[PDB]
Amino acid sequence: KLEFMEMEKEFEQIDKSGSWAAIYQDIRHEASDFPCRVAKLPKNKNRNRYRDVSPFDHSRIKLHQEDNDYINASLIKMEEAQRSYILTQGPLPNTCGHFWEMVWEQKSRGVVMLNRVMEKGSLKCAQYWPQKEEKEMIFEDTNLKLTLISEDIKSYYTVRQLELENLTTQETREILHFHYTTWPDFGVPESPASFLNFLFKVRESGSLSPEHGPVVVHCSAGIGRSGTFCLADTCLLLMDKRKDPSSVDIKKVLLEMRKFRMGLIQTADQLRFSYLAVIEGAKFIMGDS
Ligand SMILES: COC(=O)c1ccc([C@@](C/C=C/c2ccccc2)(Cc2ccc(C(F)(F)P(=O)(O)O)cc2)n2nnc3ccccc32)cc1
Ligand SMILES: [Cl-]
């Protein structure tokens, strides 16, 4: 029982010794590496938002296009946690069709967005979804139609319901879009509570359920914020299923996740935040709630 005051004690111990950056750099250097040949092909240069962030060849999501099957997106599968996620970059002006094509083919039912489309001091992301219910979007290259159906705006996040339609089979699917709007580039969420609240919300939607395809998670590069979000989620799952919560080594989990996509969690503070959100979140889930 009193095993929760343990992990939070070593957390404060790490905080006391200011060892976060050390642990984080240790993780960057223990991180596995795999080839990204497809990602680096000249024809896929314009499909990559950033020169140095690429999906590994083994876990990259392949588009069912006959021509070019590339999309900077990676499938992260966590066995013990029993959860899969697709991490991708913020869609580019020329890859919005690819993005939705992937959402369709992969049968995902939810999209989690952790970055903002624009501002001034923030990385730009393409407006890959319709902002107005009356202005649906058609992606000619992927023969898909997208319509905004609902848009519940809250303080730290907006929940939108979209309708994605395969113009060929004429099938339509409800896609839930969870947009956390207060997580700056290379920063942390507004607070652990808002982050968790957002996470629990995405959870309760069933968007992460094994019933549907893997949820799609992205920020700008698809590694810092996306990695933090997924790491927190997986670790919470693990602390809930395991008899011994403190047996969950967030560091091992992150390294495990990095085998599927490079650079997950981009700052020492994000790592700290993941520990903090997981400990607090674990307390909540096991504390009556
Ligand atoms: C001035 O613009 C920026 O703020 C900026 C910061 C970092 C970067 C990264 C920096 C590259 C980092 C990297 C490279 C190799 C392995 C792992 C990480 C890409 C990147 C952007 C944002 C994030 C994030 F953390 F905000 P996310 O939450 O959206 O994921 C991550 C990465 N990047 N990718 N290729 C580069 C080539 C030269 C210099 C920097 C480069 C790009 C732009
Ligand atoms: Cl890194």
UniProtKB/Swiss-Prot annotation:
Species, as recorded: Homo sapiens (Human)
Location of Cysteine persulfide modifications: 219
Post-translational modification, as annotated: Oxidized on Cys-219; the Cys-SOH formed in response to redox signaling reacts with the alpha-amido of the following residue to form a sulfenamide cross-link, triggering a conformational change that inhibits substrate binding and activity. The active site can be restored by reduction. Ser-54 is the major site of phosphorylation as compared to Ser-246 and Ser-247. Activated by phosphorylation at Ser-54.
Active site: 219 (phosphocysteine intermediate)
Full-protein positions shown: 1 to 285 of 435
Annotated protein name in UniProt: Tyrosine-protein phosphatase non-receptor type 1
Residue positions where Phosphoserine is found in the record: 54, 246-247
EC number in record: 3.1.3.48
A single GO molecular function term of this UniProt record: protein kinase binding
Domain Tyrosine-protein phosphatase: 7-281
PTM sites of type Cysteine sulfinic acid (-SO2H): 219
